[PDB]
Amino acid sequence: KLWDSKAQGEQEELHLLKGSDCNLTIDITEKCLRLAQRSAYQLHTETSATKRIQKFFLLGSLNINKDDRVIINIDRFDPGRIIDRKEGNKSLHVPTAVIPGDVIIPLSMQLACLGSEGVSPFSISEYYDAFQTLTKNLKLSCDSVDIKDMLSLKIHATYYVDSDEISINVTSGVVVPSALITAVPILPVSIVPTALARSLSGPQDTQKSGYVAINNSHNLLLVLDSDPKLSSIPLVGIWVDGVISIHHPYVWSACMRYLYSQRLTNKIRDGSTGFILVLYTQTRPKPEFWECSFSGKSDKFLYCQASDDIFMEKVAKTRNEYMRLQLVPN
């Protein structure tokens, strides 16, 4: 045995939305929706044979509240640019300017023909391809763990304009990995007191994470997520700093990242054997140790949509009105 796996506390079940009661909240500022409708109507009037389906992007920020409540605050519309790689004749549709920290939400909107009770948001023809691309990015990324790389959200909006007001039915849908991480508190393991370990047990509310290596003396060495030795060094887990508890969604995101990464080719401890998590919480001077395991289906995902009507005055009252959407999964 590489270390002692005896449980020192209650088991915990990890998932992205566990702390948030499986609920994902979306707040969209009525101003950015109004800009989206304006652009859609211009497009819809610039050509007459093309059916009215506009292609835009919305831009948001990811925020996590007092009680681990995940909220996406979408407040910027960006019509986007078209670029041509010349691989295929069809031109490509891309956001205007991808900002680091921006949640990119593809926005499709169309004027409803007569009446559409059935709502199909984030259809499989486009959402499915987008989510395949998303998980492909999640498998190969070398960057720090980012909660934004863990979900793919799209919005379909059906709108109508009359002389008095603009009315819009907004259906917003998201997909995300379903994997639950089983976590068991375990007894502390000796860590080589390197400079990283000393700075880690020391004192900003910025999350950071890394990976866990082992040396000849069977002592644990903490490693940065940017260390080039990671490609073949034997890895047994991760370290995470800067959260209040294990229920913070950043922890589930880091666990998923460790399990999925194919840049780490020497993961001698994984989900079947159990791997180590060194958690440097903000409420304790020393880290907590957990053994994590997973045994279910690897490529299964959670998804859902929400929809609501909104009625807007033609004149944008100088308010900060917004629309709140929740998560109602299948």
Residue numbers in the entry: 13 to 215, 222 to 348
Can you provide the manuscript's text about this entry?
Here we demonstrate that CEP85 is essential for faithful centriole duplication through a direct interaction with the previously uncharacterised N-terminal domain of STIL, a key factor involved in the early steps of centriole formation. Subsequently, through its C-terminal PB3, PLK4 interacts with STIL and phosphorylates it, enabling STIL to recruit SASS6 to the site of procentriole assembly.
Subsequently, we also determined the structure of the complex between Trichoplax adhaerens STIL-NTD and human CEP85 cc4 by X-ray crystallography to a resolution of 4.6 Å. The structure of the complex was solved by MAD using crystals of the corresponding selenomethionine derivative. The structure of the CEP85-STIL complex shows a 2:2 binding ratio with one STIL NTD bound to each of the two coiled-coil strands of the parallel CEP85 cc4 dimer. Compared with the unbound CEP85 coiled-coil structure we did not observe any density for the N-terminal half of the coiled-coil, probably due to its partial unfolding in the crystal. The interaction between the CEP85 coiled-coil and STIL NTD involves mainly subdomain 1 of STIL, in particular the region of the β-barrel capping helix and the crossover hairpin-loop that, together, constitute one of the two conserved patches in the STIL NTD. Each of the STIL NTDs interacts with both CEP85 coiled-coil helices. The crossover hairpin-loop of subdomain 1 of STIL NTD contacts towards the N-terminal part of one of the coiled-coil helices, whereas its barrel capping helix contacts towards the C-terminal end of the other CEP85 coiled-coil helix. Due to the relatively low resolution of the complex structure we could not resolve any sidechains. However, several conserved residues of the CEP85 coiled-coil and STIL subdomain 1 would be well placed to make electrostatic and hydrophobic interactions with each other. The structure of the complex between STIL NTD and CEP85 cc4 indicated that the highly conserved residues L47 and R50 in Trichoplax adhaerens STIL (L64 and R67 in human STIL, L60 and R63 in Gallus gallus STIL) and human CEP85 Q640 and E644 are located at their interaction interface.
